Amino acid sequence: TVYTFPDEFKLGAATASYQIEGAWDENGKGPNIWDTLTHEHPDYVVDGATGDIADDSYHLYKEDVKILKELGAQVYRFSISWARVLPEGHDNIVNQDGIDYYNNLINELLANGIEPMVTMYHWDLPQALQDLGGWPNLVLAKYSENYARVLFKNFGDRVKLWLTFNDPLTFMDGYASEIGMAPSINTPGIGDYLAAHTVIHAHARIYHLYDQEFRAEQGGKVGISLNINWCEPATNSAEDRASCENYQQFNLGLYAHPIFTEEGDYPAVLKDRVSRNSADEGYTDSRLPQFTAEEVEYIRGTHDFLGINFYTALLGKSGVEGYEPSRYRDSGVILTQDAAWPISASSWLKVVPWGFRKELNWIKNEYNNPPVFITENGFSDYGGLNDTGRVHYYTEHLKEMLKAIHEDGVNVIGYTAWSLMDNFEWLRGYSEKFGIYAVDFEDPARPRIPKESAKVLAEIMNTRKIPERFRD
Numbered sequence: 001t002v003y004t005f006p007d008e009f010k011l012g013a014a015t016a017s018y019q020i021e022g023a024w025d026e027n028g029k030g031p032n033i034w035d036t037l038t039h040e041h042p043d044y045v046v047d048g049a050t051g052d053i054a055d056d057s058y059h060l061y062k063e064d065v066k067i068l069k070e071l072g073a074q075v076y077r078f079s080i081s082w083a084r085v086l087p088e089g090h091d092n093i094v095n096q097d098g099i100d101y102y103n104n105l106i107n108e109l110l111a112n113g114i115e116p117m118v119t120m121y122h123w124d125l126p127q128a129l130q131d132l133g134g135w136p137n138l139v140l141a142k143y144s145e146n147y148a149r150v151l152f153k154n155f156g157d158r159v160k161l162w163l164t165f166n167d168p169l170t171f172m173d174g175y176a177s178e179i180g181m182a183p184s185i186n187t188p189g190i191g192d193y194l195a196a197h198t199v200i201h202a203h204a205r206i207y208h209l210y211d212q213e214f215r216a217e218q219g220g221k222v223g224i225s226l227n228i229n230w231c232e233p234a235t236n237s238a239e240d241r242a243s244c245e246n247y248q249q250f251n252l253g254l255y256a257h258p259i260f261t262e263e264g265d266y267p268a269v270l271k272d273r274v275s276r277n278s279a280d281e282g283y284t285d286s287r288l289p290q291f292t293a294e295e296v297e298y299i300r301g302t303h304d305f306l307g308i309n310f311y312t313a314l315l316g317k318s319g320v321e322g323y324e325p326s327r328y329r330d331s332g333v334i335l336t337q338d339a340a341w342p343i344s345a346s347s348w349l350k351v352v353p354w355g356f357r358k359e360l361n362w363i364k365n366e367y368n369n370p371p372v373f374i375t376e377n378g379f380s381d382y383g384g385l386n387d388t389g390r391v392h393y394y395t396e397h398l399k400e401m402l403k404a405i406h407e408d409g410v411n412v413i414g415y416t417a418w419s420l421m422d423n424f425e426w427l428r429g430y431s432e433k434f435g436i437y438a439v440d441f442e443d444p445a446r447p448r449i450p451k452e453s454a455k456v457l458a459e460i461m462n463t464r465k466i467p468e469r470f471r472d
């Protein structure tokens with residue numbers, strides 16, 4: 001039983017637009033902040049890589065569907081490129097080529113018995129909107145609503161699973177470093193919080209838009225995908241436990257408390273720690289933006305499910321470190337990793353499968369067991385088809401998730417492996433491989449070929465259980 005997937009549970013794989021599509025300026029697509037970063041600042045990216053071509057999925061989408069069908073995916077999670085649809089960011093011009101492209105992908109998926117799951121925003125803001133300040137500028141919440149309306153109107157007759165945003169915990173950090181994630185602006189502890197605030201507002205507008213203009217006719221579900229690491233207390237002390245709760249609230253709670261609790265608003269510890277730190281540093285005003293009571297009420301409850309992106313764990317102990325001002329310093333935890341944990345090809349990613357179960361239980365208890373769709377989970381290596389580490393990563397994480405479901409009563413409803421194929425891995429270029437299909441980035445045809453992990457995942461998807469040889 002503990003090794004069998006529930007009958008209605010949805011299994012598949014996931015990608016993101018800038019990571020796979022290429023065709024960065026083809027057929028009317030406007031520039032986004034990743035075009036800007038990779039073109040203007042190749043020194044920020046391993047190998048000076050760009051997403052100009054990537055997997056060429058703009059041209060090769062039928063090949064993506066072919067491999068999804070081979071895999072036996074029930075669902076394919078992909079993102080839509082805002083600037084491919086609205087090249088100017090604003091909704092004055094709709095690019096028919098972009099409409100046609102996503103319709104073509106959606107229709108191909110459905111013709112092959114694969115359900116589309118669409119992420120509206122996976123990090124590729126139109127440059128025209130960044131030029132207004134980007135996410136720190138609250139005007140982007142209305143612009144996001146208008147973008148979502150175009151998506152619902154054009155695609156919502158066939159798409160019934162939506163994520164507004166992918167991992168704003170990460171993309172807000174594009175406003176906390178001069179050399180990091182696009183748009184690579186150095187306003188730590190100030191601009192990243194403003195970005196978060198706008199994203200939460202935007203999410204809520206999009207959810208209400210769906211309720212008002214589309215839900216009755218379309219009958220789908222709207223969620224948001226949040227990344228969170230498990231944070232294990234470095235010792236069993238109450239103080240170290242406090243630090244790990246701080247971590248959860250400052251990473252997951254920042255977004256999930258406003259949306260997924262009955263109370264709404266930011267977590268108290270977030271408001272209080274930032275208030276105190278801001279006062280101590282001499283600011284008249286807290287660095288953390290505020291919601292009015294009316295906004296709190298508007299934002300809370302804007303969900304049909306919670307998307308979770310889970311990769312790894314950290315150790316947390318009592319204390320404060322990091323630069324003043326910064327979210328990490330404000331969070332009041334000292335973070336490390338255990339040298340004993342298995343490694344990957346990514347410095348930040350260690351293999352800690354039991355952390356997945358712990359995180360799922362933390363979510364269950366904090367948010368009253370919302371339906372949870374695992375929108376990303378995966379592992380990096382530097383190459384190779386005999387990807388034993390990736391196979392082990394998947395089988396262990398899936399076993400831990402199944403324990404969360406069956407033993408712990410967590411309402412997990414689906415899982416999409418990150419990623420369908422090797423792709424442009426942001427600042428790491430093509431140097432880190434997350435795919436279950438390999439892609440030859442030196443071959444203009446970009447062939448996709450299955451790794452051992454794709455074969456094992458196909459076996460899991462076909463049999464709907466963890467094969468005996470991977471059981472404890």
Ligand SMILES: O=S(=O)(O)CCN1CCN(CCO[C@@H]2O[C@H](CO)[C@@H](O)[C@H](O)[C@H]2O)CC1
Pocket residue numbers: 016166167170180227309311348376418425427434
């Ligand atoms: O610049 S660093 O400070 O050294 C490391 C930045 N973190 C940001 C959070 N990522 C995990 C969640 O982010 C996921 O990660 C996947 C693998 O990286 C990506 O392919 C997905 O697009 C993304 O959603 C991990 C890397």
Ligand SMILES: [Cl-]
Pocket residue numbers: 468469
């Ligand atoms: Cl066997």
Ligand code: NA
Pocket residue numbers: 094150153154
């Ligand atoms: Na339209």
